[PDB]
Amino acid sequence: TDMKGIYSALLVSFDKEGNINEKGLRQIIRHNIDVCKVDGLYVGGSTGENFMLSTDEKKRIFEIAKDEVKEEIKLIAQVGSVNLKEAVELAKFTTDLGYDAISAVTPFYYKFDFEEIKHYYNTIINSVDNRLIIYSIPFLTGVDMSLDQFGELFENEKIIGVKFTAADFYLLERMRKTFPNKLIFAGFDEMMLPATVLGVDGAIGSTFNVNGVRARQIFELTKNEKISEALEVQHVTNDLITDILGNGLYQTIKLLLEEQGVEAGYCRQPMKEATDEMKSRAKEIYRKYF
Amino acid sequence: DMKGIYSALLVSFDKEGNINEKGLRQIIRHNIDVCKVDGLYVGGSTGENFMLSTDEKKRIFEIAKDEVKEEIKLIAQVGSVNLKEAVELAKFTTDLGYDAISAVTPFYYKFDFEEIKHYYNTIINSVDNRLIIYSIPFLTGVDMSLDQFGELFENEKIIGVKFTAADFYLLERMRKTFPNKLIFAGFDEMMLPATVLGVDGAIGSTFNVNGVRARQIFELTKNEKISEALEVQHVTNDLITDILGNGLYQTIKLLLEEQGVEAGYCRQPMKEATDEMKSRAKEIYRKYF
Amino acid sequence: TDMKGIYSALLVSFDKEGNINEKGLRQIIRHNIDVCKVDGLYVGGSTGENFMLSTDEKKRIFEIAKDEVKEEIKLIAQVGSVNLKEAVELAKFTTDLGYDAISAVTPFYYKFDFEEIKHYYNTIINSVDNRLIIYSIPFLTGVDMSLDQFGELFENEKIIGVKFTAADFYLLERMRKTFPNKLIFAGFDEMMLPATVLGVDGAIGSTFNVNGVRARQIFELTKNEKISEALEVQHVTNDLITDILGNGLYQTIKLLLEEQGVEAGYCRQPMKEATDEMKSRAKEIYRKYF
Amino acid sequence: TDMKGIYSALLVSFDKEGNINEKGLRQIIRHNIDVCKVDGLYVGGSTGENFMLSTDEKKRIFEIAKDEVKEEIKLIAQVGSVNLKEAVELAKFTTDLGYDAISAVTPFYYKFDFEEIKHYYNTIINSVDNRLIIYSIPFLTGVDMSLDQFGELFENEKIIGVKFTAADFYLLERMRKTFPNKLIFAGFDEMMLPATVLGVDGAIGSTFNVNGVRARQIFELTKNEKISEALEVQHVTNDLITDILGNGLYQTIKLLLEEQGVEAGYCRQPMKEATDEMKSRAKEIYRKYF
Ligand SMILES: CC(=O)N[C@H](C=O)[C@@H](O)[C@H](O)[C@H](O)CO
């Protein structure tokens, strides 16, 4: 399966008790496919509140997404974890479900050296008949890998690409040039335009759950070299992202979906519950950009 | 009373990464009988806690309690990015008889102060126990202020904090401002300066093998024998430096193995000790023990 | 004078004793005008090793630059430093010499709050009849200005722009959209293409002293929407920048200039004199990209 | 001259326009000697606002300090800066004046490596018949050298010590143990007690300009192992430092001096001036601790 394209980092619906709301999750999935019209879904990433869930919950979500999607669009499973045993188990689980590729965040919390990180990735991908995408996001893990390290990881032909969610466009350009045969995904929604001109093969973002159409436009307009128009869409997109971040990122995106009849529900505690003020702000945000 | 020296309990894992109960019980016995610490801090970073499944975490808590019984004090670190898991673990360890629980600041996601406060309140209000705050900016990237620490202490069931910041200015301020809260030093290599500033004890990974020297540092300081305490800290830091340069958790386990304690391996992706690491560990053992 | 365009952050020539080489300095200047074809020069910047020079040396440099350039190209004078009195004196000196605009880096070393930084800029520009460009460079200063703070500075109609040398494209995009009437200069040579797509009004770079032609191609191809081409020029540019950084930034740029027929000379101590290995490496870099 | 003990990082008095106020400087000096009774003065440091001054001004201050002090107490001259040429010049000037030792901060702004930092220190000390103390400042310069390099620097027998103005107590302890034959000075006023417990040979602080008596008590009492007694003094001193820090460090220390008849004058812009409110607050601090 060709993995290039726009992927929404799937959000998950939870009830007030923190339990998964399958009805709501399937509505979020339907929204992304039918309305946002994205090329695929990145399941189990940060946006899905993955690291706040139990292994059983992660697996349940993986099942629901595969089931609801069927074979309509591509699916990437983020199976990374500080627990390498769990990562391998999730890798096998998602591979057996039929996910088109897997992805793994660099092991965090503890301070692993490159030899250990390489062991982590190889152990995961060598345990399954699938393809792996490296997930960096130095912003949250604190793990900043160099070009030569990535080059050593890319040694493995099953490690087909990387999701770069760092603000280093120098390294991004260097990776594009050095690894012309690997896939490079942008993970920073508010910087999609400058990433696309550097040659990324697609994008994976949390805001695509509600802004998938514009996000696709920024990408396609740039590939068509209509930079002026692409910039304008990025400007509008960033006005939206700025308002969302100021009102609480995940809570606001979920409230935007609720406005459209998608029961995205609550966020997992300790992520705060939306106040009446955040709710009112969400409505104004919706009226301004949708 | 919870004051004193606590070893952040290391766990014995085998080649496959599985818990080795026999080895774990030997590590516990070594800490009590040889290191002579006042208690164990179970489920912390040192125990490789965050690389484990909830089931394994629970087994370790039960084994530790069973082996220790009432011999020394026990604090269970139940913190997690998964608040539901933390609550389950807080209840489980409270039912087991743990003297207190502790919780690292939720990490990975960037939670604001309001959310961190809810996190802590949710955990301790769920059980009939007492809570110690675990603040480790070095691994989590979260550093609070004196004012914030104050709002948290509004919950009477939060009785203290494990300090792991190199900011002794903050430590000095907190000691005088909250003389009724427990403050634990979490940086083995800076135990002496922490003790002179009033910490009520220490929680460290190196005490698994260096508990006697750790106690001397603490007690000498309390008795104003600062010069002698500094010398013990010098030798202790020579050891800590060798261990850090040779692989922290792996080397402590090798040092225990040298004494017949089956401490075993660390869970992958933490590397297995190479031959060079094993040889170095023998040199280290000969020089400091 | 319209200040849009490509500016070379002028390097200065020094002998082995660390004394200014006037002929060399004039050759660098002439090289930028006649060979690099830049729109102007940014004099007194970090690249000119400004902060390692005495106030009198700074003045001689400003005089030589103006005398040599005359009116052929535009001139921007960086007059900032930790010493404000010196800054105000230099703003006067350069304004009287006829510099088209002045620039001022955020005061560093000490931790000045925003009010102090704001007064620093107003004091400087209000002291003369000129226009000022802000110079952030958070990479070497540690000062991180927010969008709102930039808005406070831009209140002064004489503060016409900013040299953005921080790799935060989110803030850059926000700046472009929020201040459409101000000039925004890119200060990251290795990220020229992505910055240009975000609408910058030009670029001020240290590598333009030897790579002015490609820099212009990147900027112009981009403005013409020929992105595939721009990316290829940026790839070669970054291969060069990568080699330069690995061999010693300033030393290698001067050695490259030497190979271009310019007596760039030595860097001032404690910046190391190029070793034999560095010298043969610089010549390899020369044969490779020039 | 043995250089152990308490040293006030000499504050400098300036007039409205920022020019040196020699009458105020000599009064500050006399205060440090006669009232604070310090072991010596550290001239040309950050506290002296040195890095906001020109070479000529730095020279005048060194002359003023030497002339006013005569031989009553020890003097250390900080001659470091980004410009090595100025450093050597000041090292010679100061040695001719009879300063007991010189000090040099690690060159900042630019990102120098160890080899260059080494050449910098050796060049300075090999040029004069004096002794050198290394100045770190990891907080303002961002230079955090390791134990192995410091060891290399100390290979030169005329490099007698180092000034630790960073709370890294692990490195401090390592330095003490590794170099029992070198001097180590604590540069963090609020943590001089735990630093003394770790074996420092003295302290260099900005608050000693007005709190030299308590500072000496803390140092000596801790040296004598009278911890509980040293702690009592540290309790009050840190309450004092907290009030000073909250009202404006340099401004408040100068206001506390004025309360005692010392015309400490202004601070050098862009540093904010002392307001009526800061004056009122400083008066309360004065009544509470003096
Ligand atoms: C190892 C290193 O520090 N850099 C890598 C080159 O080898 C790449 O990441 C690029 O050179 C990059 O520009 C700097 O990291």
PDB file of C-alpha atoms in Angstrom, chain C residues 63-224:
ATOM      1  CA  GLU C  63      33.411  54.400   7.247  1.00  0.00           C
ATOM      2  CA  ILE C  64      35.221  52.006   4.937  1.00  0.00           C
ATOM      3  CA  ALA C  65      31.994  50.243   3.954  1.00  0.00           C
ATOM      4  CA  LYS C  66      30.214  53.478   3.058  1.00  0.00           C
ATOM      5  CA  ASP C  67      33.229  54.914   1.241  1.00  0.00           C
ATOM      6  CA  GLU C  68      33.713  51.734  -0.781  1.00  0.00           C
ATOM      7  CA  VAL C  69      30.033  51.208  -1.594  1.00  0.00           C
ATOM      8  CA  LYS C  70      29.078  54.868  -1.977  1.00  0.00           C
ATOM      9  CA  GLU C  71      25.596  54.506  -3.401  1.00  0.00           C
ATOM     10  CA  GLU C  72      25.886  51.502  -5.526  1.00  0.00           C
ATOM     11  CA  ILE C  73      23.921  49.303  -3.101  1.00  0.00           C
ATOM     12  CA  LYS C  74      21.896  49.644   0.109  1.00  0.00           C
ATOM     13  CA  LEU C  75      23.435  49.733   3.572  1.00  0.00           C
ATOM     14  CA  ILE C  76      22.091  48.610   6.928  1.00  0.00           C
ATOM     15  CA  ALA C  77      24.130  49.264  10.052  1.00  0.00           C
ATOM     16  CA  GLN C  78      23.908  46.928  13.047  1.00  0.00           C
ATOM     17  CA  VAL C  79      24.545  49.313  15.940  1.00  0.00           C
ATOM     18  CA  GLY C  80      23.376  47.278  18.937  1.00  0.00           C
ATOM     19  CA  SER C  81      25.403  45.654  21.733  1.00  0.00           C
ATOM     20  CA  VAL C  82      25.343  45.213  25.510  1.00  0.00           C
ATOM     21  CA  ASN C  83      26.518  48.833  25.776  1.00  0.00           C
ATOM     22  CA  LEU C  84      23.611  51.172  24.967  1.00  0.00           C
ATOM     23  CA  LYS C  85      25.627  54.418  25.005  1.00  0.00           C
ATOM     24  CA  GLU C  86      27.810  52.883  22.298  1.00  0.00           C
ATOM     25  CA  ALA C  87      24.707  51.827  20.377  1.00  0.00           C
ATOM     26  CA  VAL C  88      23.280  55.346  20.365  1.00  0.00           C
ATOM     27  CA  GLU C  89      26.667  56.722  19.344  1.00  0.00           C
ATOM     28  CA  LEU C  90      26.926  54.275  16.442  1.00  0.00           C
ATOM     29  CA  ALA C  91      23.375  55.021  15.316  1.00  0.00           C
ATOM     30  CA  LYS C  92      24.396  58.682  15.065  1.00  0.00           C
ATOM     31  CA  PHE C  93      27.703  57.930  13.365  1.00  0.00           C
ATOM     32  CA  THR C  94      26.157  55.651  10.728  1.00  0.00           C
ATOM     33  CA  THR C  95      23.113  57.853  10.141  1.00  0.00           C
ATOM     34  CA  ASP C  96      25.443  60.773   9.438  1.00  0.00           C
ATOM     35  CA  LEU C  97      27.430  58.546   7.064  1.00  0.00           C
ATOM     36  CA  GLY C  98      24.192  58.044   5.176  1.00  0.00           C
ATOM     37  CA  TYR C  99      23.324  54.435   6.034  1.00  0.00           C
ATOM     38  CA  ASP C 100      19.871  53.599   4.647  1.00  0.00           C
ATOM     39  CA  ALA C 101      18.808  51.942   7.889  1.00  0.00           C
ATOM     40  CA  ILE C 102      20.110  50.719  11.216  1.00  0.00           C
ATOM     41  CA  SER C 103      19.629  47.468  13.095  1.00  0.00           C
ATOM     42  CA  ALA C 104      19.990  46.488  16.744  1.00  0.00           C
ATOM     43  CA  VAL C 105      20.387  43.055  18.277  1.00  0.00           C
ATOM     44  CA  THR C 106      18.521  42.363  21.503  1.00  0.00           C
ATOM     45  CA  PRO C 107      20.774  43.325  24.435  1.00  0.00           C
ATOM     46  CA  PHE C 108      22.379  40.176  25.844  1.00  0.00           C
ATOM     47  CA  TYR C 109      24.499  38.578  28.586  1.00  0.00           C
ATOM     48  CA  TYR C 110      22.345  40.198  31.284  1.00  0.00           C
ATOM     49  CA  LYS C 111      18.705  39.116  31.538  1.00  0.00           C
ATOM     50  CA  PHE C 112      16.846  42.300  30.536  1.00  0.00           C
ATOM     51  CA  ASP C 113      13.052  42.164  30.784  1.00  0.00           C
ATOM     52  CA  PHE C 114      10.775  43.412  27.998  1.00  0.00           C
ATOM     53  CA  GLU C 115      10.298  46.960  29.310  1.00  0.00           C
ATOM     54  CA  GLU C 116      14.073  47.364  29.335  1.00  0.00           C
ATOM     55  CA  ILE C 117      14.368  45.857  25.850  1.00  0.00           C
ATOM     56  CA  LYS C 118      11.585  48.134  24.584  1.00  0.00           C
ATOM     57  CA  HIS C 119      13.316  51.226  25.969  1.00  0.00           C
ATOM     58  CA  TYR C 120      16.595  50.047  24.470  1.00  0.00           C
ATOM     59  CA  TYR C 121      15.065  50.085  20.972  1.00  0.00           C
ATOM     60  CA  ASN C 122      13.146  53.364  21.378  1.00  0.00           C
ATOM     61  CA  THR C 123      16.195  55.119  22.805  1.00  0.00           C
ATOM     62  CA  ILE C 124      18.262  54.019  19.819  1.00  0.00           C
ATOM     63  CA  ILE C 125      15.865  54.922  16.989  1.00  0.00           C
ATOM     64  CA  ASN C 126      14.471  58.061  18.623  1.00  0.00           C
ATOM     65  CA  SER C 127      18.024  59.416  18.865  1.00  0.00           C
ATOM     66  CA  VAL C 128      18.342  59.686  15.084  1.00  0.00           C
ATOM     67  CA  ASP C 129      16.544  60.450  11.840  1.00  0.00           C
ATOM     68  CA  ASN C 130      16.608  56.924  10.428  1.00  0.00           C
ATOM     69  CA  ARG C 131      14.650  53.645  10.377  1.00  0.00           C
ATOM     70  CA  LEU C 132      15.325  50.575  12.511  1.00  0.00           C
ATOM     71  CA  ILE C 133      15.162  46.824  12.030  1.00  0.00           C
ATOM     72  CA  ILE C 134      14.991  44.488  15.041  1.00  0.00           C
ATOM     73  CA  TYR C 135      17.622  41.711  15.242  1.00  0.00           C
ATOM     74  CA  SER C 136      16.444  38.783  17.418  1.00  0.00           C
ATOM     75  CA  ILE C 137      19.018  35.960  16.955  1.00  0.00           C
ATOM     76  CA  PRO C 138      17.707  33.862  19.920  1.00  0.00           C
ATOM     77  CA  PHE C 139      20.248  31.178  18.992  1.00  0.00           C
ATOM     78  CA  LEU C 140      23.152  33.235  20.361  1.00  0.00           C
ATOM     79  CA  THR C 141      21.269  35.543  22.747  1.00  0.00           C
ATOM     80  CA  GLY C 142      18.655  33.370  24.431  1.00  0.00           C
ATOM     81  CA  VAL C 143      16.030  36.099  24.129  1.00  0.00           C
ATOM     82  CA  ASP C 144      12.637  34.810  22.951  1.00  0.00           C
ATOM     83  CA  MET C 145      10.284  37.620  21.921  1.00  0.00           C
ATOM     84  CA  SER C 146       6.569  36.791  21.615  1.00  0.00           C
ATOM     85  CA  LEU C 147       4.127  37.959  18.927  1.00  0.00           C
ATOM     86  CA  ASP C 148       2.528  40.488  21.289  1.00  0.00           C
ATOM     87  CA  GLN C 149       5.887  41.939  22.316  1.00  0.00           C
ATOM     88  CA  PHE C 150       6.899  42.459  18.687  1.00  0.00           C
ATOM     89  CA  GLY C 151       3.602  44.279  18.323  1.00  0.00           C
ATOM     90  CA  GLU C 152       4.575  46.637  21.128  1.00  0.00           C
ATOM     91  CA  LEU C 153       7.865  47.524  19.462  1.00  0.00           C
ATOM     92  CA  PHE C 154       6.249  48.021  16.044  1.00  0.00           C
ATOM     93  CA  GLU C 155       4.234  50.834  17.629  1.00  0.00           C
ATOM     94  CA  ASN C 156       7.185  53.071  16.763  1.00  0.00           C
ATOM     95  CA  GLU C 157       6.650  54.013  13.108  1.00  0.00           C
ATOM     96  CA  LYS C 158      10.426  54.292  12.726  1.00  0.00           C
ATOM     97  CA  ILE C 159      10.812  50.595  13.554  1.00  0.00           C
ATOM     98  CA  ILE C 160      10.079  49.281  10.058  1.00  0.00           C
ATOM     99  CA  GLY C 161      11.045  45.623  10.319  1.00  0.00           C
ATOM    100  CA  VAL C 162      12.765  42.640  11.894  1.00  0.00           C
ATOM    101  CA  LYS C 163      15.581  40.212  11.082  1.00  0.00           C
ATOM    102  CA  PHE C 164      14.070  36.887  12.124  1.00  0.00           C
ATOM    103  CA  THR C 165      16.945  34.524  12.925  1.00  0.00           C
ATOM    104  CA  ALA C 166      14.905  31.966  14.903  1.00  0.00           C
ATOM    105  CA  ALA C 167      13.756  28.675  13.357  1.00  0.00           C
ATOM    106  CA  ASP C 168      10.161  29.125  14.560  1.00  0.00           C
ATOM    107  CA  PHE C 169       8.118  29.179  11.366  1.00  0.00           C
ATOM    108  CA  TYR C 170       4.878  29.291  13.339  1.00  0.00           C
ATOM    109  CA  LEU C 171       5.900  32.681  14.771  1.00  0.00           C
ATOM    110  CA  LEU C 172       7.277  33.738  11.384  1.00  0.00           C
ATOM    111  CA  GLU C 173       3.953  33.008   9.675  1.00  0.00           C
ATOM    112  CA  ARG C 174       2.129  34.823  12.494  1.00  0.00           C
ATOM    113  CA  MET C 175       4.446  37.821  12.111  1.00  0.00           C
ATOM    114  CA  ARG C 176       3.867  38.005   8.329  1.00  0.00           C
ATOM    115  CA  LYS C 177       0.095  37.882   8.759  1.00  0.00           C
ATOM    116  CA  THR C 178      -0.030  40.185  11.792  1.00  0.00           C
ATOM    117  CA  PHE C 179       2.362  42.832  10.439  1.00  0.00           C
ATOM    118  CA  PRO C 180       1.796  43.026   6.651  1.00  0.00           C
ATOM    119  CA  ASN C 181       3.171  46.587   6.617  1.00  0.00           C
ATOM    120  CA  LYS C 182       6.551  45.747   8.165  1.00  0.00           C
ATOM    121  CA  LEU C 183       9.652  44.211   6.590  1.00  0.00           C
ATOM    122  CA  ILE C 184      10.554  40.666   7.599  1.00  0.00           C
ATOM    123  CA  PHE C 185      14.049  39.377   6.863  1.00  0.00           C
ATOM    124  CA  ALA C 186      15.084  35.738   7.044  1.00  0.00           C
ATOM    125  CA  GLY C 187      18.344  35.200   8.906  1.00  0.00           C
ATOM    126  CA  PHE C 188      18.705  31.436   8.454  1.00  0.00           C
ATOM    127  CA  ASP C 189      20.553  30.769   5.184  1.00  0.00           C
ATOM    128  CA  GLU C 190      19.910  27.012   5.354  1.00  0.00           C
ATOM    129  CA  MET C 191      16.147  27.647   5.559  1.00  0.00           C
ATOM    130  CA  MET C 192      15.799  30.360   2.906  1.00  0.00           C
ATOM    131  CA  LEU C 193      13.300  28.483   0.731  1.00  0.00           C
ATOM    132  CA  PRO C 194      10.744  27.766   3.475  1.00  0.00           C
ATOM    133  CA  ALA C 195      11.071  31.300   4.827  1.00  0.00           C
ATOM    134  CA  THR C 196      10.529  32.831   1.392  1.00  0.00           C
ATOM    135  CA  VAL C 197       7.326  30.840   0.904  1.00  0.00           C
ATOM    136  CA  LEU C 198       6.077  32.467   4.124  1.00  0.00           C
ATOM    137  CA  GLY C 199       6.453  35.898   2.547  1.00  0.00           C
ATOM    138  CA  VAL C 200       9.720  37.340   3.894  1.00  0.00           C
ATOM    139  CA  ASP C 201      10.832  40.581   2.258  1.00  0.00           C
ATOM    140  CA  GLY C 202      14.417  39.477   1.802  1.00  0.00           C
ATOM    141  CA  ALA C 203      17.279  37.788   3.593  1.00  0.00           C
ATOM    142  CA  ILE C 204      20.362  38.763   5.566  1.00  0.00           C
ATOM    143  CA  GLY C 205      22.937  35.996   5.596  1.00  0.00           C
ATOM    144  CA  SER C 206      26.566  35.317   6.389  1.00  0.00           C
ATOM    145  CA  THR C 207      26.996  32.713   3.637  1.00  0.00           C
ATOM    146  CA  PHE C 208      25.902  35.201   0.979  1.00  0.00           C
ATOM    147  CA  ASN C 209      29.448  36.600   1.077  1.00  0.00           C
ATOM    148  CA  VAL C 210      30.480  33.525  -0.939  1.00  0.00           C
ATOM    149  CA  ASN C 211      27.156  32.071  -2.075  1.00  0.00           C
ATOM    150  CA  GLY C 212      25.245  35.196  -3.112  1.00  0.00           C
ATOM    151  CA  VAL C 213      24.417  33.850  -6.566  1.00  0.00           C
ATOM    152  CA  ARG C 214      22.651  30.692  -5.346  1.00  0.00           C
ATOM    153  CA  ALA C 215      20.977  32.656  -2.554  1.00  0.00           C
ATOM    154  CA  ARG C 216      19.493  34.967  -5.184  1.00  0.00           C
ATOM    155  CA  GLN C 217      18.428  32.000  -7.328  1.00  0.00           C
ATOM    156  CA  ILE C 218      16.610  30.444  -4.356  1.00  0.00           C
ATOM    157  CA  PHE C 219      14.781  33.683  -3.553  1.00  0.00           C
ATOM    158  CA  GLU C 220      13.931  34.525  -7.168  1.00  0.00           C
ATOM    159  CA  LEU C 221      12.935  31.014  -8.257  1.00  0.00           C
ATOM    160  CA  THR C 222      10.622  30.895  -5.231  1.00  0.00           C
ATOM    161  CA  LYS C 223       8.997  34.262  -5.985  1.00  0.00           C
ATOM    162  CA  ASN C 224       8.441  32.837  -9.480  1.00  0.00           C
TER     163      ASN C 224
END
